[PDB]
Amino acid sequence: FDLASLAIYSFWIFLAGLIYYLQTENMREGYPLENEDGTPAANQGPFPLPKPKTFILPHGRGTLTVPGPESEDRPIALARTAVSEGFPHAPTGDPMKDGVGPASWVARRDLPELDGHGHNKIKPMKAAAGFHVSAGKNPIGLPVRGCDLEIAGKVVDIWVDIPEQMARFLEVELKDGSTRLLPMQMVKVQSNRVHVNALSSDLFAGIPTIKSPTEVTLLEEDKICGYVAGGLMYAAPKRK
Amino acid sequence: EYQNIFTQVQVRGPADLGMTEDVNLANRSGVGPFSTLLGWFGNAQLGPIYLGSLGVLSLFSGLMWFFTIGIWFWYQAGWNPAVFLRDLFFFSLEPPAPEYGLSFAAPLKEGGLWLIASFFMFVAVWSWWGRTYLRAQALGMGKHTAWAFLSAIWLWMVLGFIRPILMGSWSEAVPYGIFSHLDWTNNFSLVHGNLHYNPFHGLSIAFLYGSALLFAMHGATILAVSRFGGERELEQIADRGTAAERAALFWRWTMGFNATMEGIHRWAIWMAVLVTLTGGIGILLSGTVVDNWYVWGQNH
Amino acid sequence: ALLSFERKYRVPGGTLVGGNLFDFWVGPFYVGFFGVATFFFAALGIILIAWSAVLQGTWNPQLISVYPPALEYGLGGAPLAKGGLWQIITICATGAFVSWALREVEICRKLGIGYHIPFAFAFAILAYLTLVLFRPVMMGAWGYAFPYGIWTHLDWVSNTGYTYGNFHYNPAHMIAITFFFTNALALALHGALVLSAANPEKGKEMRTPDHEDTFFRDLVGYSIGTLGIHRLGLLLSLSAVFFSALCMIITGTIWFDQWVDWWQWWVKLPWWANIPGGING
Ligand code: BCL
Ligand code: BCL
Ligand SMILES: CC[C@H]1c2cc3[nH]c4c(c3C)C(=O)[C@H](C(=O)OC)c4c3nc(cc4[nH]c(cc(n2)[C@@H]1C)c(C(C)=O)c4C)[C@@H](C)[C@@H]3CCC(=O)OC/C=C(\C)CCC[C@H](C)CCC[C@H](C)CCCC(C)C
Ligand SMILES: COC1=C(OC)C(=O)C(C/C=C(\C)CC/C=C(\C)CC/C=C(\C)CC/C=C(\C)CC/C=C(\C)CC/C=C(\C)CCC=C(C)C)=C(C)C1=O
Ligand SMILES: COC(C)(C)C(=O)C/C=C(\C)CC/C=C(\C)CC/C=C(\C)CCCC/C(C)=C/CC[C@H](C)CC/C=C(\C)CCC=C(C)C
Ligand SMILES: CCCCCCCC/C=C\CCCCCCCC(=O)OC[C@H](O)CO
Ligand SMILES: CCCCCCCCCCCC[N+](C)(C)[O-]
Ligand SMILES: CCCCCCCCCCCC[N+](C)(C)[O-]
Ligand SMILES: CCCCCCCCCCCC[N+](C)(C)[O-]
Ligand SMILES: CCCCCCCCCCCC[N+](C)(C)[O-]
Ligand SMILES: CCCCCCCCCCCC[N+](C)(C)[O-]
Ligand SMILES: CCCCCCCCCCCC[N+](C)(C)[O-]
Ligand SMILES: CCCCCCCCCCCC[N+](C)(C)[O-]
Ligand SMILES: [Cl-]
Ligand SMILES: [Fe+3]
DSSP, rough: HHHHHHHHHHHHHHHHHHHHHHHTTTTSSSSBOOTOOOTBBBBBOOOOOOOEEEEEEEOOEEEEOOOOOOOOOOOOOEEOOOOOSSOOOOOOOOHHTTOOOOOOOOOOOOOOOOTTTTSEEEEEEESSOOEEEEEEEOOOOOEOOOOSSEEEHHHHEEEEEEETEEEEEEEEEEEESSSEEEGGGGOESSSSSSOSSSSSSSGGSSSOSSSBBBBBHHHHOOOOOOOOHHHHHHHHGGOO | OOSSSSSSEEOSOOOOOOOOOOOOOOGGGOOOOOOHHHHHTTTTOOOOOOOHHHHHHHHHHHHHHHHHHHOOOOOOTTHHHHHHHTTTOOOOOOOOOGGGGOOOOOOOOGGHHHHHHHHHHHHHHHHHHHHHHHHHHTTTTSSHHHHOOOOOOOOHHHHIIHHHHHOOOOOGGGOOOOHHHHHHHHHHHHHHHHGGGGGHHHHHOOOHHHHHHHHHHHHHHHTTGGGTTTTTEEEHHHHHOHHHHHHHHEEEEEEEEEEEOOOOHHHHHHHHHHHHHHHHHHHHHHHHTTTTTTHHHOOO | OBBBTTGGOSSSOOOOTTTSSSSOOETTOHHHHHHHHHHHHHHHHHHHHHHHHHHTTTTTTTEEEEEEOGGTTTOOOGGGGGGGHHHHHHHHHHHHHHHHHHHHHHHHHHHTTTTTHHHHHHHHHHHHHHHIIIHHHHHTTTTSSSOTTTHHHHHHHHHHHTSSOGGOOOHHHHHHHHHHHHHHHHHHHHHOOOOOOOSSSTTTTOOHHHHHHHHEEEESSSSOHHHHHHHHHHHHHHHHHHHHHHHHHTBBBTTTTTTGGGGGGHHHOOOTTOOOSSSSO
16 A cells, blocks of 8 residues: 555546546537437436536627527428337438438527627628738639539639638529529639539529628528538439 | 648738737737748738747746757867767756755756756746736636646656655756657666556556547547538537537447537547646656556556 | 437438448447448457457456467468467457448448548558558568557567667657657647637636637747647647657668667768767767
């Protein structure tokens, strides 16, 4: 029972408590577990639910307390494929339009994210005084091409994260004159074109639209990004 | 498929002068140039930097440490620039010999200079710690950075100050040299019966390896959901989005459990600080309480 | 059981093999074909470990050790008790690691996310194969691989390193270490920065990412950004492992002397090589 033996025993005790604390802290979202019918699950695990904490959000946007009563706050167009638990739930309609699977989106607040000074974090470059392309290929004017090798539109503007000085969306003008946003992370800027592998040219029109031409909300961002990511699975039929 | 490792199109605007809060704007420099080079991988803006009394003190004190070791290397090199560059990695500023114990009466060339350099390094590191605390305070932020820094300071304090004192001799401290401080590390293990069998050293390794495991996991995860804006982690904490959900579901389906967007950063900060926290303990017990770790290990 | 938000993501599709045959979950775990493969290899390797323990004569996990064949076996097969079990367990381990990664790929497809995670895991796999496959083969014997034992495999590290003096002087070893230390440095800072912004001083509102930027510009005059730090962390951890495999694949294959001798090309440059004085004069 020398001093070194007690240090290492003490530490293992400390570490078991640290793990217990870290795991409960990581249960402030998505818990309690549910059955596939929405009801609470009987077996919740050995770790209990943590006690609520409160974040005071800046810009008078309220406060968040987690854990709290959870809600999807949106309809889910899926149906059970098995009586037993553990099997896929099959889309009942058009999964890209119904926003399920890889096309899923979360019902975030229908407000734009703000920067430290209370201004919209993301802005079209035509509304961002002083911003420009400093390196690489400027995609404005370039045609946008889908996974079917057809042209869907041309890039008309870039939406930039101003505090971070980063391109986040390409505003693409469609054949009918309207525009859509494309995640910067899902496009390939080439010399003479912008290639989007996730969608076919005739699926750009289906990208959810924004209600203001100079701002995009967190809800809109989730709907846009989910739709485009869902094309990798659901637009593959006509992928050249 | 675009992978988001390097920026495709850089954009640049008016420099960001930053948040004000209670920062004393008198001590902020001007903005530096933009770096297209860094812009491919991160932000291209350089500066501004805050520079108060502590920063100046840390900076000046840190350069005195640097210069102290330097003139000693030029003296070992016989003042020959050719010899200086040849044997740069072999030069070493060693602590006082065991004979002097914990005395500061060691002549400069027999560990007296090592004591001066250690004083400047001591002032530079601790003033820099105070800097990480007050910079966060001035912005109203938590002090998680200063506390994580203490963990690294702990191991440095044990190696060069706490343990030598408990051993009763400055000669137990580490020398200032590239190759010399590697040799010190190798001899420390041989003398103490193989550190592989110091359990706090094995724990330290588990957390070092685990820090690379966790950052690869976390970095790769955030990039894989950056198509959903996953890197904007603070707003994902205040308003969970599909980025945070897919990230959690990937790991739940893979290994059976998962984190939250906030909770993963608690896993991270503890994984990293436990490296130097356990390591400092293992060193502090070597030679004070345990002489031979292998032999000690065979009784437990 | 599911997370409150999980159901909408549990759709069919994304598999690479078997269509919908293995497209289901057991509790939280996704199966898929490579979930079955993983289970097969893992179950088989664990039996062979228990079998080695019986041949060894102990059931204490701290003493079990499966050794590779003796050098005299070269790169041929060995009898089960004389290195064969190590050989079969190395096959099973490889099967499990690779199956695990392809399962992760199937989970990326169902969730519509990038493939960065299995890509990063493949670096760890490459490092395992460097030590148990590439380096033994280039050296001509399985015995150069390390034994599967909790403590015996640390002895192997020490024996292998001291065969070349102080392994510290392996220059690729230095680089790998630098990335390991820098990675833990960067992980600690990143965790602390997010938490300091989400959990500010008492009586304060949640901070913004602009505060995170400002804090680091105030501290060191530069902020890499919210995206760049995750890029950086991925890079520091993989680079560390890359140079680790590199520092070993060259040890015993193209370099055979003590690693401190490698640094003589600098010391013995014929111009200053003979200038008197210094450490090497
Ligand atoms: C990497 C270069 C060297 C090496 C050098 C060292 C040194 C030096 C040390 C270790 C240590 C450990 N090593 Mg080793 N080790 C190597 C290869 C391996 C491999 C492998 C398959 O390649 C494995 C699985 C291990 C496993 C282990 C653990 C017993 C221990 C803590 C690791 C850890 O937490 O890492 C980070 C990972 C995590 C935090 C995630 C969790 C991982 C858990 C802990 C893995 C448990 C594996 C289990 C014991 C073995 C398989 C069980 C099967 C059911 C049969 N080593 C090679 C040969 N390893 C330390 C120790 O205490 O050893 C006694 C130590 O000091
Ligand atoms: C006396 C010993 C020698 C020495 C000799 C060696 C030797 C010999 C080697 C190293 C290697 C390493 N040394 Mg050295 N080294 C020494 C001193 C040090 C010091 C120090 C501070 O003194 C440090 C910091 C290091 C640092 C390091 C790293 C660069 C590297 C280990 C990481 C690695 O490769 O991971 C690679 C990662 C892996 C192997 C993990 C792979 C995991 C697989 C894919 C999955 C496993 C799954 C698991 C079984 C599942 C469990 C599931 C359960 C649910 C838990 N050495 C001294 C001088 N060192 C090693 C190296 O570079 O290897 C390539 C190596 O072989
Ligand atoms: C590449 C950078 C770092 C990294 C990254 C990394 N590791 C990863 C991943 C990533 C990105 C994953 O996605 C994957 C994962 O799911 O993690 C939770 C994983 C993973 N990294 C793990 C471990 C691990 N990673 C390590 C290191 C690293 N991982 C690097 C430092 C280390 C060490 C020693 O440093 C370990 C021990 C696992 C927890 C997990 C992979 C789990 C897996 O493959 O599961 C399927 C296999 C089994 C369930 C077991 C099979 C059993 C075998 C048949 C028998 C065992 C034989 C073995 C040779 C025994 C030897 C023991 C002795 C050496 C003591
Ligand atoms: C930002 O977003 C993030 C998250 O969400 C918001 C996260 O959630 C995570 C995950 C990370 C954590 C939860 C932290 C804890 C992890 C650590 C410390 C790593 C170390 C991990 C471990 C020690 C666990 C290892 C576990 C296993 C290997 C599982 C055991 C294996 C089993 C049971 C077998 C697997 C099952 C099958 C193959 C299928 C079954 C087969 C049949 C035939 C039935 C990350 C990285 C993240 O960035
Ligand atoms: C042209 O070149 C010039 C001359 C200009 C140069 O400047 C060249 C300079 C260099 C090339 C610098 C080279 C630098 C090195 C080789 C540094 C290597 C450093 C290490 C390996 C780090 C080891 C540090 C470990 C120790 C022993 C740290 C001591 C810290 C203690 C906690 C402090 C102890 C304090 C003491 C004893 C007393 C002081 C006061 C107190 C209140 C405690
Ligand atoms: C161009 C360089 C100028 C001088 C540099 C000084 C030396 C820094 C050394 C190591 C720390 C590595 C830095 C990375 C740590 C960043 C932590 C983090 O999470 O940052 C995210 C972002 O900055 C929040 O918005
Ligand atoms: C590195 C050690 C990791 C240990 C983590 C242990 C925590 C496992 C939590 C399982 C419970 C999860 N569940 C069923 C409640 O969702
Ligand atoms: C010695 C290392 C200690 C580990 C550091 C862990 C960070 C948690 C501390 C929370 C600090 C919060 N606070 C009150 C200062 O804002
Ligand atoms: C924060 C995550 C904690 C993970 C803990 C991992 C434990 C690794 C086991 C190492 C065993 C070392 N020891 C004491 C036997 O020498
Ligand atoms: C010693 C390390 C072991 C940690 C491995 C964790 C196993 C899986 C975690 C629990 C998931 C399964 N569960 C409890 C939800 O049924
Ligand atoms: C190494 C890559 C993975 C593929 C190898 C598959 C071998 C194991 C066979 C398991 C499948 C068995 N079964 C009956 C479910 O098809
Ligand atoms: C299923 C994946 C196979 C990859 C190769 C596995 C490497 C293990 C090598 C063991 C050598 C044993 N044997 C019988 C071939 O001599
Ligand atoms: C040395 C070869 C074996 C490495 C394991 C291969 C499987 C890892 C998963 C593939 C990674 C490629 N990617 C980016 C398409 O996911
Ligand atoms: Cl300051
Ligand atoms: Fe993060």
